[PDB]
Symmetry: D2
């Protein structure tokens, strides 16, 4: 199974993508063993990016690696098709899309038509990004089977039965969990890996969890998974999407600029409180030799 990072998008204080900070982060993740990078995902604020900015993300990360799944979805199908077509010139792993968001109670037929349209124009394997809480609707294993053209799915949902059903109904699909908390379990249970937001700031931890689980060191894998869970939980206190920038600086040492408002940066008081929640974990990880310092 693989660890895939939904890469954060660094923005400048002028609210533009900071390409040079993006490349440093991408080079580091690849160096520390991350298999592939998911670009324009939730963690990268994809829904806050214009199509031009989605493409800009791909270009900059493509300077570092071709190990990329390129998220192109949105509420203007013509723009999503254009991005899909444009990816022809990049030797990447796949494109992806979440379901059309915001609008409640979209028919099954319309949702299927949306995805099959992307498949029809896609010059690469197409990944489903299933995230019901964010998008307001579910594209479960049976609907995915009906769409019929997915190479893989990232299933972000608090229900592993739901995730296993993709494998059960679609044996040749790649099936990933969107949870950092499930890296040990997913590697234990025959699933294909994790697109793990926490691998932005602790790629070492997520890779080592997966390694230990593969080795069938399940108790050791769980011990480390449970320390990583505490960092995930600390990140959620002030808002994980914002906290991810702070934790990446803290653990990896380079910064990633600002998020894009209304995803606001943590203020000084919030940062201090976040660091006090994780510095002990950071000590344990250095002790364990997972982190250098």
């Amino acid at each position: 199974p693989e660890i895939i990072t939904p890469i954060i998008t660094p923005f400048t204080k002028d609210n533009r993508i900071d390409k040079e900070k993006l490349k440093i982060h991408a080079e580091n993740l690849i160096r520390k063993g991350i298999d592939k990078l998911f670009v324009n995902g939730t963690t990268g604020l994809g829904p806050s990016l214009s199509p031009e900015e989605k493409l800009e993300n791909l270009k900059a990360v493509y300077d570092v690696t071709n190990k990329i799944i390129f998220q192109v979805g949105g509420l203007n199908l013509d723009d999503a098709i254009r991005l899909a077509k444009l990816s022809k010139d990049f030797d990447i792993v796949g494109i992806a899309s979440y379901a059309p968001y915001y609008y409640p109670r979209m028919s099954e037929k319309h949702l299927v038509k949306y995805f099959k349209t992307l498949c029809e124009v896609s010059p690469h394997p197409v990944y489903l990004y299933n995230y019901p809480t964010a998008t307001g609707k579910d594209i479960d294993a049976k609907v995915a089977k009906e769409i019929g053209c997915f190479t893989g799915v990232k299933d972000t949902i608090e229900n592993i039965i739901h995730t296993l059903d993709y494998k059960r109904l679609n044996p040749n699909m790649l099936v990933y969990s969107g949870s950092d908390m499930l890296i040990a379990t997913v590697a234990s249970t025959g699933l294909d890996g994790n697109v793990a937001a926490g691998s932005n700031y602790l790629p070492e931890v997520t890779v080592t969890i997966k390694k230990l689980a593969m080795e069938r060191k399940i108790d050791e894998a769980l011990k480390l998974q449970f320390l990583h869970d505490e960092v995930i939980e600390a990140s959620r206190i002030f808002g994980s999407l914002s906290s991810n920038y702070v934790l990446t600086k803290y653990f990896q040492g380079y910064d990633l600029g600002y998020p894009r408002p209304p995803i606001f940066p943590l203020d000084d008081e919030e940062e201090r409180q976040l660091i006090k929640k994780v510095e002990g974990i950071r000590a344990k990880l250095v002790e364990l030799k997972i982190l250098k310092e």
Copy 2:
């Protein structure tokens, strides 16, 4: 109380806004007794419009009327602030925003900041568009009070206790329900009216439910409310946002072109089946003299 129309956005065959068609629709709404037009709302596919398109919509409708509430919200706060500022040379009723959508679990602090920012830059009264199911979060009476700068609220929620609480906690605030099914009830119970999607295609009915209820003719208001409910229900069969276009052409006699995919137009057969569901209702309304021929 008032009937406000979240006006449909007509698109051409090639996915641009049909400005002349939008002006015809707007003019007919005003002439048929609609009080204001809520531009770039959900019914208008506001989340699917770039900021420039949001501005185009305001300019087209403004050629017809200044009775406008201009919705400017989005996931790029620099863009919504720009739209808010640009509205200064339009003598309109107000600007509006839904909450930042898609991203789950955004903090009270951050949501509060987003809306206080818009109010800080706004040259007009600001209206809250509260839509928990689409945006994934709720800006209730309490949070509205803490933001402290809203002139009015559109509450799209089935819970009328929730809507009544805006008035309870903010006595001066104008408070509209986002439901077509609650026109008689809103009018009876001391609230300020409805922002009603179905008034796009049946403005005569929604204006008449309001008036009946205003005159304490509750049984009659309800009779007509219950008829209108059947039309809402039929619009949901193939997708209300797509169905609104078909109903407007059917009931009002002019067309509004296409929605924007992934809000896909109904096909011929769905159009036919939709019309069959509402024929006998059209007939009742002609007979009641609410509609002509």
Copy 3:
């Protein structure tokens, strides 16, 4: 429209029904203008009562009045049938049942059969007690129509569109809201009344809101409804079912003993903090001559 009290079941210090206190409570409710008493409801802790105790509550209240709806539902259909049958010697308004609770995913067919079974053996008119949050299932206007034998419905739900639909789909059905916060609205919108927990302790307030709304004094009815809402809200702080006991003694001047654990009594401090939250309101109602003091 009516105000109906889902009467509290006072328990003794050794966890038995206090018959004398229940008769004293029932006399006062009837004296103060309450229309009917709903016995073994949620407020009465019906699900915590054995079938014997549910009969005992009926016998006691019936000493005071004929104006009783007798709730008999439970997870043993034979006991519910037996309570239905035993009601034949009581000259009461009707019997009632919530849907079978606890077990999720019960089929529509098995739900219809449970209610049709009770209608088949009932010597009295049958009222639907619809409470989806408590029971885990919804018996909506269309399901009620399918069951076909309800004389009325109490709909405890935060969605008045849902409550209105009972009237729409079943024009002869009596339709009550289970909300205290909706007394002004329900009377202004053509529904039949409220089965209101808060009328245990403020029957005078509930009757007055209803009267003011009936007389079309909506702003007066709201002002009063909004004050009542603050009392409801205070009661939720430490748990409504437990607080109702404390409030009834505070406002009506007699003791109602204890709830039945695990609905635990308020402790001295909770009781003191609660009274502190409503004492300003008690003063205002005295000043308005709604409460005599």
Copy 4:
């Protein structure tokens, strides 16, 4: 890890517990390798049982094996205390309780006090039965740690993150999933097993999944798990609690009488239809040498 059966309670035509049938089923389960029996659980319709019937189930099952977890909870705490103190004379594994069900919005303090009360009187280890959808309340790993007296937990929830959390926050606690669909996964990931409704009718399948997973034959375990999932899905067509009876007689060859209405028995036609849905699965199981024929 273990497979624990939440054993069905067989009822006679006249709605009493069929002791002899219960004993035969209990005996067969143990002989087929089931580790422990969970008595008066959801599958055994415990909320539909009086305290006297809960105790009668314990006595009959105790004739067969002492490997019993005795579920005692309900909405009368005195009766649950009584059942707990009565279990003193039985040399069994433990007692258990779900949270007080039906009543929404019970405070954490009241839920804690309910369980600690049962812990203070228990003559055996105490197990948490956590079932949020059925009871309306979640007693999560943090609340479990606060209560402080649980030897183990049965977590009936699809979110395995939530189940792993009990282990994380309470490392000495026995942690079981209530899902039949998570048997391979739970065994793989270092949890203690499953309390599986489907082990009533396919005990041999559930124990083999567990053993395959234990042997790290994940693909083989999943294959069998996926077949087992199809029987669970089939059981849900006409209602799982009712269907469990028909499947047990079908797969195990003896009958378990009747459920207790409103859990109504399947009819002849529904039985025929269910069997036709699982026939082909039975053939697969025979071909895999799990079942004889």
